[PDB]
Amino acid sequence: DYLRELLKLELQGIKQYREALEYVKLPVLAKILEDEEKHIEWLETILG
């Protein structure tokens, strides 16, 4: 469940990054988003 909580936070996090990127085209935000996508993939993997 602790991993599920980290995942849930990561999922909430990306929605916020994506909303900013709807309005401002800042590459640093797309860069962070890219890492968050990987964070999410690793958590899903270790959760099975």
Next chain:
Amino acid sequence: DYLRELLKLELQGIKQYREALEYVKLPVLAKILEDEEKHIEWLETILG
């Protein structure tokens, strides 16, 4: 302010990753943590 809100989420998230690493020494969690610290420094930088 939207950047301050992303920074807040990142700071709340880093605390959850740090607590799990107190207990389970999973390199994948430390890999995420190292990225999050960079996310935070990037937000601090662009906020000035």
